[PDB]
mmCIF file with all atom_site columns, all heavy atoms in Angstrom:
data_model
loop_
_atom_site.group_PDB
_atom_site.id
_atom_site.type_symbol
_atom_site.label_atom_id
_atom_site.label_alt_id
_atom_site.label_comp_id
_atom_site.label_asym_id
_atom_site.label_entity_id
_atom_site.label_seq_id
_atom_site.pdbx_PDB_ins_code
_atom_site.Cartn_x
_atom_site.Cartn_y
_atom_site.Cartn_z
_atom_site.occupancy
_atom_site.B_iso_or_equiv
_atom_site.pdbx_formal_charge
_atom_site.auth_seq_id
_atom_site.auth_comp_id
_atom_site.auth_asym_id
_atom_site.auth_atom_id
_atom_site.pdbx_PDB_model_num
ATOM 1  N N   . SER P 1 16 ? 83.704 -3.807  315.919 1.00 29.45 ? 187 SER P N   1
ATOM 2  C CA  . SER P 1 16 ? 84.609 -4.700  315.172 1.00 29.45 ? 187 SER P CA  1
ATOM 3  C C   . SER P 1 16 ? 83.773 -5.420  314.147 1.00 29.45 ? 187 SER P C   1
ATOM 4  O O   . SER P 1 16 ? 83.003 -6.284  314.489 1.00 29.45 ? 187 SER P O   1
ATOM 5  C CB  . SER P 1 16 ? 85.324 -5.610  316.120 1.00 29.45 ? 187 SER P CB  1
ATOM 6  O OG  . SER P 1 16 ? 84.459 -6.498  316.748 1.00 29.45 ? 187 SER P OG  1
ATOM 7  N N   . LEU P 1 17 ? 84.017 -5.113  312.881 1.00 28.13 ? 188 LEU P N   1
ATOM 8  C CA  . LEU P 1 17 ? 83.364 -5.783  311.752 1.00 28.13 ? 188 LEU P CA  1
ATOM 9  C C   . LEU P 1 17 ? 84.329 -6.616  310.925 1.00 28.13 ? 188 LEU P C   1
ATOM 10 O O   . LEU P 1 17 ? 85.534 -6.292  310.917 1.00 28.13 ? 188 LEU P O   1
ATOM 11 C CB  . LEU P 1 17 ? 82.727 -4.726  310.868 1.00 28.13 ? 188 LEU P CB  1
ATOM 12 C CG  . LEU P 1 17 ? 82.000 -5.209  309.567 1.00 28.13 ? 188 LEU P CG  1
ATOM 13 C CD1 . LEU P 1 17 ? 80.847 -6.123  309.948 1.00 28.13 ? 188 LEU P CD1 1
ATOM 14 C CD2 . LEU P 1 17 ? 81.553 -4.077  308.707 1.00 28.13 ? 188 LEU P CD2 1
ATOM 15 N N   . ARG P 1 18 ? 83.825 -7.685  310.328 1.00 28.15 ? 189 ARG P N   1
ATOM 16 C CA  . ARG P 1 18 ? 84.661 -8.644  309.613 1.00 28.15 ? 189 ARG P CA  1
ATOM 17 C C   . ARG P 1 18 ? 84.077 -8.914  308.261 1.00 28.15 ? 189 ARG P C   1
ATOM 18 O O   . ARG P 1 18 ? 83.007 -9.541  308.098 1.00 28.15 ? 189 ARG P O   1
ATOM 19 C CB  . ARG P 1 18 ? 84.748 -9.904  310.408 1.00 28.15 ? 189 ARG P CB  1
ATOM 20 C CG  . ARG P 1 18 ? 85.719 -10.963 309.899 1.00 28.15 ? 189 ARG P CG  1
ATOM 21 C CD  . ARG P 1 18 ? 85.747 -12.129 310.925 1.00 28.15 ? 189 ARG P CD  1
ATOM 22 N NE  . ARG P 1 18 ? 86.617 -13.245 310.514 1.00 28.15 ? 189 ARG P NE  1
ATOM 23 C CZ  . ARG P 1 18 ? 87.899 -13.277 310.652 1.00 28.15 ? 189 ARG P CZ  1
ATOM 24 N NH1 . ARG P 1 18 ? 88.525 -12.227 311.263 1.00 28.15 ? 189 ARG P NH1 1
ATOM 25 N NH2 . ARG P 1 18 ? 88.610 -14.329 310.268 1.00 28.15 ? 189 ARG P NH2 1
ATOM 26 N N   . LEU P 1 19 ? 84.841 -8.535  307.183 1.00 29.82 ? 190 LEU P N   1
ATOM 27 C CA  . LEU P 1 19 ? 84.478 -8.812  305.839 1.00 29.82 ? 190 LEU P CA  1
ATOM 28 C C   . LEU P 1 19 ? 85.169 -10.066 305.342 1.00 29.82 ? 190 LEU P C   1
ATOM 29 O O   . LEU P 1 19 ? 86.304 -10.374 305.763 1.00 29.82 ? 190 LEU P O   1
ATOM 30 C CB  . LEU P 1 19 ? 84.805 -7.650  304.908 1.00 29.82 ? 190 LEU P CB  1
ATOM 31 C CG  . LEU P 1 19 ? 84.003 -6.352  305.148 1.00 29.82 ? 190 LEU P CG  1
ATOM 32 C CD1 . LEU P 1 19 ? 84.543 -5.206  304.279 1.00 29.82 ? 190 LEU P CD1 1
ATOM 33 C CD2 . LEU P 1 19 ? 82.556 -6.597  304.955 1.00 29.82 ? 190 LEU P CD2 1
ATOM 34 N N   . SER P 1 20 ? 84.548 -10.849 304.491 1.00 30.46 ? 191 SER P N   1
ATOM 35 C CA  . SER P 1 20 ? 85.041 -12.081 303.995 1.00 30.46 ? 191 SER P CA  1
ATOM 36 C C   . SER P 1 20 ? 84.900 -12.213 302.495 1.00 30.46 ? 191 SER P C   1
ATOM 37 O O   . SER P 1 20 ? 84.080 -11.453 301.903 1.00 30.46 ? 191 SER P O   1
ATOM 38 C CB  . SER P 1 20 ? 84.372 -13.304 304.685 1.00 30.46 ? 191 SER P CB  1
ATOM 39 O OG  . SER P 1 20 ? 84.605 -13.307 306.064 1.00 30.46 ? 191 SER P OG  1
ATOM 40 N N   . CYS P 1 21 ? 85.685 -13.092 301.928 1.00 30.94 ? 192 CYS P N   1
ATOM 41 C CA  . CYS P 1 21 ? 85.668 -13.274 300.448 1.00 30.94 ? 192 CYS P CA  1
ATOM 42 C C   . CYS P 1 21 ? 86.053 -14.688 300.126 1.00 30.94 ? 192 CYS P C   1
ATOM 43 O O   . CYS P 1 21 ? 86.937 -15.268 300.759 1.00 30.94 ? 192 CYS P O   1
ATOM 44 C CB  . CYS P 1 21 ? 86.617 -12.275 299.843 1.00 30.94 ? 192 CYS P CB  1
ATOM 45 S SG  . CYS P 1 21 ? 86.713 -12.366 298.100 1.00 30.94 ? 192 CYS P SG  1
ATOM 46 N N   . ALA P 1 22 ? 85.496 -15.254 299.112 1.00 31.00 ? 193 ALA P N   1
ATOM 47 C CA  . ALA P 1 22 ? 85.782 -16.615 298.598 1.00 31.00 ? 193 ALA P CA  1
ATOM 48 C C   . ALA P 1 22 ? 85.915 -16.617 297.073 1.00 31.00 ? 193 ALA P C   1
ATOM 49 O O   . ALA P 1 22 ? 85.395 -15.740 296.355 1.00 31.00 ? 193 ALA P O   1
ATOM 50 C CB  . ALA P 1 22 ? 84.741 -17.619 299.047 1.00 31.00 ? 193 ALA P CB  1
ATOM 51 N N   . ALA P 1 23 ? 86.604 -17.632 296.580 1.00 30.70 ? 194 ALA P N   1
ATOM 52 C CA  . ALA P 1 23 ? 86.799 -17.852 295.132 1.00 30.70 ? 194 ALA P CA  1
ATOM 53 C C   . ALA P 1 23 ? 86.440 -19.259 294.756 1.00 30.70 ? 194 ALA P C   1
ATOM 54 O O   . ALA P 1 23 ? 86.114 -20.067 295.628 1.00 30.70 ? 194 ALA P O   1
ATOM 55 C CB  . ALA P 1 23 ? 88.236 -17.520 294.722 1.00 30.70 ? 194 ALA P CB  1
ATOM 56 N N   . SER P 1 24 ? 86.500 -19.571 293.453 1.00 30.27 ? 195 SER P N   1
ATOM 57 C CA  . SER P 1 24 ? 86.272 -20.938 292.989 1.00 30.27 ? 195 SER P CA  1
ATOM 58 C C   . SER P 1 24 ? 87.313 -21.270 291.940 1.00 30.27 ? 195 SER P C   1
ATOM 59 O O   . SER P 1 24 ? 87.261 -20.725 290.846 1.00 30.27 ? 195 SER P O   1
ATOM 60 C CB  . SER P 1 24 ? 84.852 -21.108 292.436 1.00 30.27 ? 195 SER P CB  1
ATOM 61 O OG  . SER P 1 24 ? 84.662 -20.295 291.280 1.00 30.27 ? 195 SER P OG  1
#
Side-chain angles (χ1 to χ4, degrees):
Chain P
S187 64
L188 177 63
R189 185 176 179 83
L190 295 174
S191 297
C192 181
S195 64

